[PDB]
């Protein structure tokens, strides 16, 4: 997958072999789907003002790379929570969660007033991966179009492992039917 991952990295990068970091805490990357960092996830009044009804913590844990929230944190806030304890490493199998995460996103967007925040620590690798996979799975986009639309609305940089996993998902979805360019 190396050179296919290299292609996706070429779509993300700034032309100096480097990658831009997010310019804001949170962005609406496609209608009613927000990707953001830990600071927005931990700010319930801010979530409520934004109209966030569902929060997917893709970095649930306790370390410099995690966000130590849980269902209890959101108890009686009106916000429905799902946590995934993913690590932001090339060897973490985030693809094992693509269906679960896509189902959660679908559950939020099925409600016409629903808005979902998918976040990690920085809103840069784990959380965008899950949104990209959702776009591929539930809107039939190929990986390059899905990655491109998210990156147009937030500086992201899925790690190379996650990119390979998205390439593998693209392959799996392409066995069902054609994917939209």
Which CATH number is 79's domain given?
Answer: 3.90.190.10
**Which method resolved this structure?**
X-ray
> Based on the structure, what is the number of domains in the chain?
1
Distance (Å, whole) CA 21 – CA 31: 22
For 22-29, which contacts have Cβ atoms below 8 Å and span 24 or more sequence positions? 22/122, 22/123, 22/124, 22/154, 22/155, 22/156, 23/155, 24/154, 25/123, 26/50, 26/117, 26/119, 26/123, 27/123, 27/153, 27/154, 28/153, 29/128, 29/131, 29/149, 29/150, 29/153, 29/154
Q: CA–CA separation, 130 vs 162, rounded Å?
A: 9
Rounded CA-CA distance 163/156 in Å is 12
Domain around 155: 3-181
* Angstrom resolution of this structure: 1.6
Does 26 qualify as catalytic in the annotation? no
Of 18, 26, 120, 167, catalytic: 120
d(CA 52, CA 4): 35
Residue 56's φ and ψ, nearest 5 degrees, are: -110, 110
Phi, psi of 168 (to 5 degrees): -65, -40
CA–CA distance, 111 with 85 (Å, rounded to integer): 26
């Amino acid at each position: 997958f190396e050179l296919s991952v290299q292609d996706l990295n070429d779509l993300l990068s700034d032309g100096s072999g480097c990658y831009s970091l997010p310019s804001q805490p949170c962005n609406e990357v496609t209608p009613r789907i927000y990707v953001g960092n830990a600071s927005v996830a931990q700010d319930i009044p801010k979530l409520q003002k934004l109209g966030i009804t569902h929060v997917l913590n893709a970095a649930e844990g306790r370390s410099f790379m995690h966000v130590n929230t849980n269902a209890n944190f959101y108890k009686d806030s009106g916000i429905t929570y799902l946590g995934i304890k993913a690590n932001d490493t090339q060897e973490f199998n985030l693809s094992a969660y693509f269906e679960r995460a896509a189902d959660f996103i679908d559950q939020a967007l099925a409600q016409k007033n629903g808005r979902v925040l998918v976040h990690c620590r920085e809103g840069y690798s784990r959380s965008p991966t899950l949104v990209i996979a959702y776009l591929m799975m539930r809107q039939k986009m190929d990986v390059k179009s899905a990655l491109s639309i998210v990156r147009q609305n937030r500086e992201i940089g899925p790690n190379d492992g996650f990119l390979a996993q998205l390439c593998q998902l693209n392959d799996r979805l392409a066995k069902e039917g054609k994917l939209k360019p």
